[PDB]
Design a protein around this nucleic acid. Sequence first.
DNA 1: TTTTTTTT
Length: 439
Amino acid sequence: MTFDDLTEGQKNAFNIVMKAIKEKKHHVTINGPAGTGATTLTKFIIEALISTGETGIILAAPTHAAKKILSKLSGKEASTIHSILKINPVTYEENVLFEQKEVPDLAKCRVLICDEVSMYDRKLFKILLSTIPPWCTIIGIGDNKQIRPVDPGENTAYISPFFTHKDFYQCELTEVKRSNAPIIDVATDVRNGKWIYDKVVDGHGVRGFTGDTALRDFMVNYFSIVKSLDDLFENRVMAFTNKSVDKLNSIIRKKIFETDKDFIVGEIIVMQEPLFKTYKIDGKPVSEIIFNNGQLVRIIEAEYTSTFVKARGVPGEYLIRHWDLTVETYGDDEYYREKIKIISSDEELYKFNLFLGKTAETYKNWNKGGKAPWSDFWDAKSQFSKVKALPASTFHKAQGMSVDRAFIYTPCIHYADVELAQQLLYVGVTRGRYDVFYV
DNA sequence: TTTTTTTT
């Protein structure tokens, strides 16, 4: 923006950066915490880097929604590191895994910028390190105090290697201009180990609910602020577990739209996984991305019907009652109108997984002659998608999403060990621009 | 007990 006029932390981070690029082998990760103004720095690292005449820049982001908002902030285009490292899903019998098909050329990139580096697990990181050549220098940026990478397969503290591995020289971003920042304060105390508390200035700030009536108060304060508003777009209620998140959208939806219904026309919902459209040509399929994971979409035609799923190589048909839901892109992204099959019954889903495992068993060992008709496995499985209602999300899924008012639900947070639960509250708190509430 | 990403 000012070119160089910035915080000492920024001014320095920049100077370190350029010399890591200007000399050979070395790397960098900047730790912006919240309030330290990490984004504007990142913006400046880019604009400046292009005007020095550097051709070799690429912007890599850990996720799709992350890549969207990265590409939007710089104005230059950016893809996922998976796209770059060329990490391609490879199908095995009943499973799927993401491994690196082949190492990309990467002679046209002398500077590799990563965003949200606090999401990198090790399996991904190693591929990364083994890929980038010496003529390239990785500059990561993220928050060591954000929610640590999810790696259920391995037990250990385990923050992203950007903040550990020897090859990276990491500098910290210094605190910014002191203004009235009730939320930034609390969040900076949470980063430092205090639990959430109340600080209110001017009438806006972090406010909790305690005593015998806690949830009733907290909820009655929600439905007053949200009311029948079908715009929750700026009000996000968060929780650790999905069990709680699910309980919430239930209660919340039932009051705002007065119904008992799983889906309602004109409601906005969020894709939990990508939606793929696949055409077969000359027998060999191709697929385009209709909806990225995290895309919000609007319900237009919503009807509850059944389906008879089958698989060649399995006896009979099975009746799976699901929703036929036609849905369009809601947002600043590409507009598609489509229809997905979506199962809500725990009763019905179970019935399906039953089938899903039977055909698996029979293809896993098949001598009928031939090899195995796996095409009828996934074609049949991909028939159904995953979604969640807009109002509430898990702390994990809310990273990077900034809303006017954030509503935080503590009770299930204790299922997380201290280190993480602090990362959760940190993430949770920093989501609200204006107000933050917690029970 | 609990959280979850990713491709032409």
